[PDB]
Amino acid sequence: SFSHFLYYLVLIVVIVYGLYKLFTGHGSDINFGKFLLRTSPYMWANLGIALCVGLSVVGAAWGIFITGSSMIGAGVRAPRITTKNLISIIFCEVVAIYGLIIAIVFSSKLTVATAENMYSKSNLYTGYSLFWAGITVGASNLICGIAVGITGATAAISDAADSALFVKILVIEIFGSILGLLGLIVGLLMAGKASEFQ
């Protein structure tokens, strides 16, 4: 398979390059640490914010079409489910709101730093903070949105069979929705002490 050949080729190239620098004594050239110090902190911050809303929306969209297609399919014989199961769509959509909210909060910190202060301790800290916090909120919302969406599909197809099953299965759905909220809480904690770009 072509794709897996590409993966192994990249892996081999990386290893050989690493050994070449290592054996010739220049092994200190790769220096990930210097790379983290010289890259501008605005890059890390903006990738964090953009992927925060981006991955969160992917989560909501991925969940919605899993539930939505099931609701429409199961609804052909039993139209009554279409309105009652809208709750399942809501639990998918809300994780986008969580991603949006974090995007508001993080945007408040994108001030312009003075040139002499550009790479100082505090500014680097904020750069790393917003990046990983944005990834954390985004990825956890992506995971949460899909998990809720899958659960919602089973709920809709159960409701079409017997109305008494719906309330029983919704308990699994609210359990799934908690994952996104915990992601939000950790996101606000990681970004809590980060100062504005001075």
Partner 1 sequence: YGIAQYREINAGLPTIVTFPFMFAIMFGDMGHGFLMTLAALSLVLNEKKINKMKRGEIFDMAFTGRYIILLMGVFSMYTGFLYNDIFSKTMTIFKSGWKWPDHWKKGESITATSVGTYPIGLDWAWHGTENALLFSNSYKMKLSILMGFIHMTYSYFFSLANHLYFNSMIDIIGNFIPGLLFMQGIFGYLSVCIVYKWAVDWVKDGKPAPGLLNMLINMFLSPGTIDDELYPHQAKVQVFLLLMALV
Partner 2 sequence: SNIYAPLYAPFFGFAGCAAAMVLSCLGAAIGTAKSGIGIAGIGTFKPELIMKSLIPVVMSGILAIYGLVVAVLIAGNLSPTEDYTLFNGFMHLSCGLCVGFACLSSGYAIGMVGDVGVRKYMHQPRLFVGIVLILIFSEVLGLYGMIVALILNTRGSE
Partner 3 sequence: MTELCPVYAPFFGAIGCASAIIFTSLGAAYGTAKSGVGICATCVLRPDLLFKNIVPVIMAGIIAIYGLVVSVLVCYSLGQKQALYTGFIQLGAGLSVGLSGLAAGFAIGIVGDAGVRGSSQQPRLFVGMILILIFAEVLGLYGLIVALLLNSRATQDVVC
Q: Does 193 bind partner 1 (CB under 8 A)?
A: no
Min dist CB 130 to partner 2, Å, is: 10
Residue 60 CA to residue 141 CA, distance in Å, equals: 8
Stretch that binds partner 1, among 71-79, 153-161, 175-183, 185-193 (CB under 8 A): 185-193
Which listed residue (87, 105, 172, 179) binds partner 1 by CB under 8 A?
105
Which listed residue (33, 164, 192, 193) binds partner 1 by CB under 8 A?
192
Number of residues that bind partner 1 (CB under 8 A): 7
**For residues 17-44, b (16+ Cβ closer than 10 Å) or e, as one string?**
eeeeeeeeeeeeeeeeeeeeeeeebbeb
Point out residues after which the chain has a gap (C–N over 2.5 Å).
Answer: none
Q: Does 105 bind partner 2 (CB under 8 A)?
A: no
CB-based contact 144:184 (threshold 8 Å): no
Please give the residue ranges that form the binding site for partner 1 (CB under 8 A): 83-84, 104-105, 188-189, 192
